[PDB]
Every structure is written in structure tokens, then in C-alpha cells.
């Protein structure tokens, strides 16, 4: 190319200046580079200094290389080909430079190039790189492998995509030759490469699986950590996708993994420990472990202690041996259930009461970890353990306090189910104290644990509501920011647990001011809104009218957040390369808060909706690609329908066809909320609903006859069908034979409320229009009517009119034989109310 002395001297001068200890020289060197980088020719100088300029020292050559790298990831589109090709050429030609720093710099350049732009645009990178493995010089093959490894890491899928002509059909069968290789580094690269294409079930690998597995075993004997680490994760991945292939060697594999899990090198052990975690997901787990389980449990238990460094760090967090071991134990507990207890109880006895806090803490962890799996088996021990754990809450070691919070929370169901004064009361008391711990980890552990307890206790908290709030409020003034987020969640779940009991002037006055205070601090782009808003949602629903003095600004901000999200999305859709896609969670939380507001206030939200474009915003939300957005919007739709239908009615003709295209059970909660919504709009439409029925009925009937459909979806589907029939018996009653069974099965099990009332009025009207529609399945109807504890008088008369009607249709004889099949409660009930 064209490097001239004057040019070179200037850049070297600038490179020297960038290495100055002087802070001002630095700031002005920054702006000097700022200008130069936009000149493609400058990049030519940069690579030249890296690869060609032998004269220059290593940190100078490499820094030139790195500046170039930054350029290749903010300006690469604007590179002409002539410079690009000069860099590409110059890199691959120096990939094995005897300087490790130069080698690394060249390497980042290659891989960054491939990454940012070269996608398929570098057609002969991979082919040359592969052949560069066959080369003589050690550094050369090492450098090439390093590059390949990195390419596979961020590029993984190069096969599954096929944007280049199936390139992996060449590479994979090429790595395993180097498994055999004399040097540890190369072995690692080779394995680390192959490993990238296991879970993907990569064609090239799957039809080469035997060669892989054989070569892996050949490595089992290797003592080089990096190799062990990679072999370990190979086996883990293989276990998930090629179960068939490793059964015949399973004993030897388990023996190997169990050894490595006990490796003194933390990293080997962690990769080894993943084996147990994924093995526990396979149905063949019990059979495979029989010879090794007795050793595995104590080994897992021992790795669940904090490491020595973590102990030191936590005095003054991501995946590690402790977490993996604890997670593995958790799943194994769910697999073995009560069979695990004889393995674990002798360990617990030595751990739970131990004089060394680290050992004790691990014991408490274990106790918590196994809670879900071994719950039945632990019941006998809880009258002793729970009081003991309660004591541990005031242990003088913070790390003991925090884990106790969690473990106790894992046994919340049992606690709540016992007399309140024996466990619940003292537990709640000590948790509250612990919420105000001076230690921040404890604060959140306690707060998290209390929330869990709240969820389980529900109304059982009502007597202690004042005492609870005292602490939660005080925490507002105590907590820094991170823990205020968990606190909002605890308040949120409290509001859900105690419902309307929360509606007291004193409670509102102590609770609301600090909630709004943080509301005013937070900006519309701060994710920390999510917990606050979700908290507000629950409070609003619980407070109802009590929320009146607070609604307006809350309402405005939410609509606004939805508006700006929709805006940002359109803007991004127009020019993706210039405007960031928005975080739709802001929209989800805002809709969900508007839903709560509407549920809480009911009719009293009218004035706000009157002044609002919320419905025109909803129209786009309902059509969003993201299920949760639709799910939130259908919920708000249902709420506004009940609260102030006059504003909704104009939109129905647009809204219905969309509701009709979202009755897809694949999206349970979207389907559910759409279904609920259409039931509520029915009631408001009356017979005006007739034209919309066909676009919705067939599907609802399909969904209510569908196996493996959640209880709640089926209940809403039944109610809605009931409701459609009430307003338009003529359109729906012909379908009676097809839905009456599951309709009845589903609704006999629900509480007597307005919705059930509404749905049964519908089923009566339909029977009056098509009685031969129920005759064959009348027992179901009988049972469903018998499920009513206190039906309204008119609904009752409808019932006995249908019952009397049926008995008269079949005559005293057929009736008495039909009623023979009545369980006693049923036979008895329809004489207390119905005289049949």
C-alpha cells in the first residue's frame, strides 16, 4: 500500500501521546483520534503499525490494533473494500505472531470483523482458518483455533441458519482430529468448539456422534483443568440431547462426574456439578444413580457451603458450586421425594445445630432446598425444626439470619395450616423484626420471605394488619433504593392478601404518602417503576373509593406511558437504525395499573376516561405482537366495560373481531382475558350482541371441550357462553348439547357470585329455547344447580321450573330411577329448595 513517512510519524506521535501519564495530553489526544477515525485511510495506518512496524514496542503496536478494533465496531459499514481487504489480508497473515499481545490483538480484530460486518461477507475466512489448523508453527494453529472458538461462541447457529452454504459440515468433522493433539490448549479449543453445537442438535454433529463420544472418553484421563472443564460440559450437554448414546457407559460416566464434582479446582467441580442438575430432569434418573446416590448427596451437601472467598467478600452474585449443588439437591428432592430423607436427615442432624456458623448456614440451606420434594416426609420433624429456625432468625451472624428467612418461607404452607398462635404468630413477629435488620441482605431476605408468607396466609393476616403496616411503613424511611423495590412487592402482596380490609383512613394515610413520594422521584424511563406500579395496582384494587384522592395523576401518567411506548415503537418501526425499540414492560405495567384503577373505582373512573384517549391506545395494544400486551389490554377492556360502558360501546364493532382472533388457547391468559372481556361486553350489549356471536361461539365451544385446559380458562369460557346465551338465546341455544357437560362440570365448582348468577340465567334461557339440548345430560344440570348455596329467588324459580319440567316430561317412574343415581347431598338439596 501507500504508507509515507510524514503520515507515519504523525500517527506514531499520536500513539505515543495516548500513552502519556498526563491527563490533559490524553483529553486532547481523544479529540485528535475522534476526527481521524472517520477517515478510512487512517485505518490503513492503524493495521500497518500493528502488523508491519517491527520497530515499535508491543503496547504501541497493540494499542494501534485496538483503536482499529473500536473503529471496526462503530464505522465498519463505511469502510471501503480496499482497506477492509488490506486488514483481512494482514490479520490472517500475522495470526501466529510470536508476541502473545500482538497475537491477541490480531485475534480480537479477526473475530470482531467476522462479528460486526463480515457475517457471510467474508466468504473465505472459515475455509482459510480451518486450513490454518493444519499449519506447522504452533502459534499459528493456536491463533487460528482461538479465532474459530470465538466465532462459534457468538456465531453459533452458522449451521442452523445456512446463510453461508452449510459451512459446519466441514468444520465439526475437523476439530476432533485435534482432540488427539499433544498440547492442552489445542485440545480445549477443539472441544470448546464442538460443544457449541450440541444443544442445537446440529446435523453435522448428530451424524458424527460416535466419533465425538469415543474421543471424549479418550480424554477422561486428562489432568489438565481446561480440558477437564470442557469434557465435563460436553457430557452435560450430551446428556440433554443424546441420552440414547451414553446409557451403555452411564456407570463409568457417573463415576467420572462424581470424581470431578469433588475436584479441588472450583471450576471443574462447577461444570461437573451441572451433570446432576440435568440428570435429575431425565426419567431414567433413579435407575442410573442406584450405585452412587449414597455418595452424591453428601458431596452435594458439602459443596453447598459458602466458599472461603465468598465468606470474606460477603463480610465486606452469580452461578457457583454452592448454587449448582443446592439446585441439584432441590431437583433430586423432587425426584426421590420421601425416599431421600434417610440420606439427608443424618446430614441435617450434624449441620443444623453445629457450632461453626458456616456449617450451620449450609444445613439451613439444605433444609430449605429439600422442602418442596420432601415436604410430606418432613412434617413429623417440623414441630421441632420450625421453632428452632425461628430462634435462628436472631442468630448473630447475618448470613445465618438471611438463609433462615428463606428456609422458613419454604415451609409457609405447613405453618399457616397449624393453629396461628403456635407457629404463624411468632414467625410473623420475628420476620417483621428482621425486615428492620441493620443488615441489607437480611432486610431483603426477610422482606422476600414475609411476602411469601403473606401469599400463603391471606385473610389470616387481617387480625395483625395494623401491626404489620407499622413495620412496612417504617421500612420506607429506613430502606435505601434496592430494598424499597422488594418492599413495594411486599405491600403489593399484602394488598392482594387482605383485600378490602386495607380500606381504612389510618392505613391509607400512613401508606399512600411515601408511595407517591417515590412516584414523583422516578422518571418515565426508570424500570424501578415496575414494582412501584405493580404495587400501586394492588393497593388501588384493595382501596377502591379510598383511592379517589390519588387516582387522577396516576391515571394520567399511565395513559401517557402507554402513549409514548406506542410512539417509540412506531418510530423504531420506521427507522430501526436510528431509534431504539421501546421496552414494552412500561406499557404492560401501565395497562395493568389502569386495570386495577378501573376495578377499584368502578363507575368513579368515568370522568377520567371521558377526558382520555385510552380506548384509541387500547386499539393498538390489542393488536400488538407481544402476548402480554394483548393480555393486559383485554383485561382493561373488561374492566372499562363494567365501569363505564358508554365510552366503550362505540368501539365494540372494531373490538369484537379482534377478540374473536385471540380465542387461541395456546396463549392461556390472553385467551382467558379475551374470553372474560367478551362475556362482560355481552351483558352490556344485550340483544345488540347478536351480529357478533358467530365470530366467537364456535371457538368458545371448541375451547370448553378441550383436554388439558386450565381450570380458570374453562370457568371463564363457561361463564361467557352462559352470558352470550342469556342475551341471545336464539344464536347459542342450538349448541347446548355440545357444551352442557363441561359447562356444568366447570361451574359446579365455583363460588356463588354475580358471574355465576349471570351464567346460569343464560343456561336457563337456553334450556327454555332448546330443552332437548339438555335432556340426555340432565344429571350434569342437576349437579350444577345443586352447587348453588344461596340462589336469588327468581333464579331458583327458573331452576324448579326446569326440574319440575323435566320430571313431568319423563313421568314418575323414569324420574325415580334417574334420581336413584343422585348422591345423597344432591337428592336432598333439590327438595330443600326445589321439591323434586
Amino acid at each position: 500500500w501507500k504508507p509515507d513517512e510524514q503520515g507515519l510519524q504523525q500517527i506514531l506521535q499520536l500513539l505515543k501521546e495516548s500513552q502519556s501519564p498526563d491527563t490533559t495530553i490524553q483529553r486532547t489526544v481523544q479529540q485528535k483520534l475522534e476526527q481521524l477515525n472517520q477517515y478510512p485511510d487512517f485505518n490503513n495506518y492503524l493495521i500497518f503499525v500493528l502488523t508491519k512496524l517491527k520497530s515499535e514496542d508491543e503496547p504501541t503496536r497493540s494499542l494501534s490494533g485496538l483503536i482499529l478494533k473500536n473503529n471496526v465496531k462503530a464505522h465498519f459499514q463505511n469502510f471501503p473494500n480496499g482497506v477492509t481487504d488490506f486488514i483481512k489480508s494482514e490479520c490472517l497473515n500475522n495470526i501466529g505472531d510470536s508476541s502473545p499481545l500482538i497475537r491477541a490483538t490480531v485475534g480480537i480484530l479477526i473475530t470482531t470483523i467476522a462479528s460486526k460486518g463480515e457475517l457471510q461477507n467474508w466468504p473465505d475466512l472459515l475455509p482459510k482458518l480451518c486450513s490454518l489448523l493444519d499449519s506447522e508453527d504452533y502459534n499459528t494453529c493456536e491463533g487460528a483455533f482461538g479465532a474459530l472458538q470465538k466465532i462459534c461462541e457468538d456465531s453459533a447457529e452458522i449451521l442452523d441458519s445456512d446463510v453461508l452454504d452449510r459451512p459446519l459440515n466441514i468444520m465439526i468433522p475437523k476439530f476432533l482430529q485435534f482432540f488427539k493433539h499433544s498440547s492442552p490448549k489445542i485440545r480445549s479449543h477443539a472441544v470448546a468448539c464442538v460443544n457449541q453445537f450440541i444443544i442445537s442438535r446440529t446435523q453435522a454433529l448428530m451424524l458424527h456422534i460416535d466419533s465425538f463420544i469415543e474421543n471424549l472418553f479418550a480424554l477422561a484421563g486428562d489432568e489438565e483443568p481446561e480440558v477437564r472443564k470442557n469434557v465435563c460440559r460436553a457430557l452435560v450437554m450430551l446428556l440433554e440431547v443424546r441420552m440414547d448414546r451414553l446409557l451403555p457407559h452411564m456407570h463409568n460416566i457417573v463415576e467420572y462426574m462424581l470424581q470431578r464434582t469433588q475436584d479441588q479446582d472450583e471450576n471443574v467441580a462447577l461444570e461437573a456439578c451441572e451433570f446432576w442438575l440435568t440428570l435429575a430432569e431425565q426419567p431414567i434418573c433413579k435407575d442410573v444413580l442406584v450405585r452412587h446416590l449414597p455418595k452424591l448427596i453428601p458431596v452435594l451437601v458439602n459443596g453447598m457451603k459458602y466458599s472461603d472467598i465468598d465468606i470474606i467478600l460477603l463480610k465486606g452474585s452469580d452461578w457457583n458450586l454452592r448454587k449448582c449443588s443446592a439446585a441439584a439437591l432441590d431437583v433430586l428432592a423432587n425426584v426421590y421425594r420421601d425416599e431421600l430423607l434417610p440420606h439427608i436427615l443424618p446430614l441435617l442432624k450434624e449441620l443444623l445445630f453445629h457450632h461453626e456458623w458456616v456449617v450451620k448456614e449450609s444445613g439451613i440451606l439444605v433444609l430449605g432446598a429439600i422442602a418442596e420434594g420432601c415436604m410430606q416426609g418432613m412434617i413429623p420433624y417440623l414441630p421441632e425444626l420450625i421453632p428452632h429456625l425461628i430462634q435462628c432468625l436472631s442468630d448473630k451472624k447475618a448470613l445465618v439470619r438471611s438463609i433462615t428467612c428463606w428456609t422458613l418461607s419454604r415451609y409457609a404452607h405447613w405453618v399457616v395450616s397449624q393453629p396461628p398462635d403456635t407457629y404463624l404468630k411468632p414467625l410473623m413477629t420475628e420476620l417483621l423484626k428482621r425486615i428492620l435488620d441493620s443488615n441489607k441482605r437480611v432486610q431483603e431476605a426477610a422482606c422476600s420471605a414475609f411476602a411469601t408468607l403473606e401469599e400463603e396466609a391471606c385473610t389470616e393476616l387481617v387480625p395483625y394488619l395494623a401491626y404489620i403496616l407499622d413495620t412496612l411503613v417504617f421500612a420506607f424511611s429506613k430502606y435505601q433504593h434496592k430494598n424499597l423495590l422488594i418492599l413495594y412487592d411486599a405491600i403489593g402482596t399484602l394488598a392482594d392478601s387482605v383485600g378490602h380490609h386495607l380500606n381504612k383512613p389510618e392505613y391509607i394515610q400512613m401508606l399512600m404518602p411515601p408511595l407517591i413520594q417515590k412516584w414523583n422521584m422516578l422518571k418515565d424511563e426508570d424500570k424501578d417503576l415496575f414494582p412501584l406500579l405493580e404495587c400501586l395496582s394492588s393497593v388501588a384494587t384493595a382501596l377502591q373509593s379510598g383511592f379517589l384522592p390519588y387516582c387522577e395523576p396516576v391515571y394520567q401518567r399511565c395513559v401517557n406511558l402507554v402513549q409514548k411506548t406506542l410512539a417509540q415503537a412506531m418510530l423504531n418501526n420506521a427507522q430501526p437504525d436510528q431509534y431504539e425499540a421501546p421496552d414494552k414492560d412500561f406499557m404492560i405495567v401501565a395497562l395493568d395499573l389502569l386495570s386495577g384503577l378501573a376495578e377499584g373505582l368502578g363507575g368513579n373512573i368515568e370522568q377520567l376516561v371521558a377526558r382520555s384517549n385510552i380506548l384509541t391506545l387500547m386499539y393498538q395494544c390489542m393488536q400488538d405482537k407481544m402476548p402480554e400486551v394483548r393480555q393486559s389490554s383485554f383485561a382493561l377492556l373488561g374492566d372499562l366495560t363494567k365501569a363505564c360502558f358508554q365510552h366503550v360501546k362505540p368501539c365494540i364493532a372494531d373490538f369484537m373481531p379482534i377478540l374473536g382472533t385471540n380465542l387461541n388457547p395456546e396463549f392461556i391468559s390472553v385467551c382467558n382475558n379475551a374470553t372474560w372481556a367478551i362475556g362482560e361486553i355481552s351483558i352490556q350489549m344485550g340483544i345488540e350482541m347478536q351480529p357478533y356471536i358467530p365470530m366467537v361461539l364456535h371457538q368458545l365451544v371448541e375451547i370448553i371441550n378441550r383436554p388439558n385446559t386450565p381450570k380458570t380458562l374453562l370457568e371463564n369460557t363457561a361463564i361467557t357462553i352462559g352470558r352470550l346465551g342469556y342475551v341471545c338465546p336464539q344464536e347459542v341455544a342450538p349448541m347446548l348439547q355440545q357444551f352442557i357437560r363441561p359447562w356444568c362440570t366447570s361451574l359446579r365448582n365455583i363460588r356463588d357470585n354475580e358471574e355465576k348468577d349471570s351464567a346460569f340465567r343464560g343456561i336457563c334461557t337456553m334450556i327454555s329455547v332448546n330443552p332437548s339440548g339438555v335432556i340426555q345430560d340432565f344429571i350434569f344440570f342437576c349437579d350444577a344447580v345443586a352447587s348453588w348455596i344461596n340462589p336469588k329467588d327468581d333464579l331458583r324459580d327458573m331452576f324448579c321450573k326446569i326440574l319440575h319440567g323435566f320430571k313431568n316430561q319423563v313421568g314418575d317412574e323414569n324420574w325415580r330411577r334417574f334420581s336413584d343415581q343422585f348422591p345423597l347431598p344432591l337428592k336432598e338439596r333439590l327438595a330443600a329448595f326445589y321439591g323434586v
Binding site: 454452592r322 448454587k323 449448582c324 443446592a326 439446585a327 432441590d330 440451606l365 430449605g368 432446598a369 438471611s402 438463609i403 428467612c405 428463606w406 431483603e444 431476605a445 422482606c447 422476600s448 420471605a449 411476602a451 411469601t452 401469599e455 423495590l485 422488594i486 412487592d489 403489593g492 402482596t493 392482594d496 415496575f530 414494582p531 405493580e534 395496582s537 394492588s538 395493568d592 386495570s595 402480554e628 393480555q631 393486559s632 383485554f634 383485561a635 373488561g638 374492566d639 392461556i668 391468559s669 382467558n672 382475558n673 372474560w676 380458570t712 370457568e715 371463564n716 361463564i719 365455583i750 363460588r751 357470585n753 358471574e755 355465576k756
Partner: peptide
């Protein structure tokens, strides 16, 4: 039961402190 499904409770569970 009969009514809308929300993810609020689930979102709170995701944010909750866990030792693993």
C-alpha cells in the same frame, strides 16, 4: 377463578430473593 389473569404475582416471585 372467574375473572382476569394477571402476571403481577408471578412478577413479584421473579424479583424475590433466592439463595439459588
Amino acid at each position: 377463578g372467574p375473572g382476569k389473569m394477571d402476571s403481577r404475582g408471578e412478577h413479584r416471585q421473579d424479583r424475590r430473593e433466592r439463595p439459588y
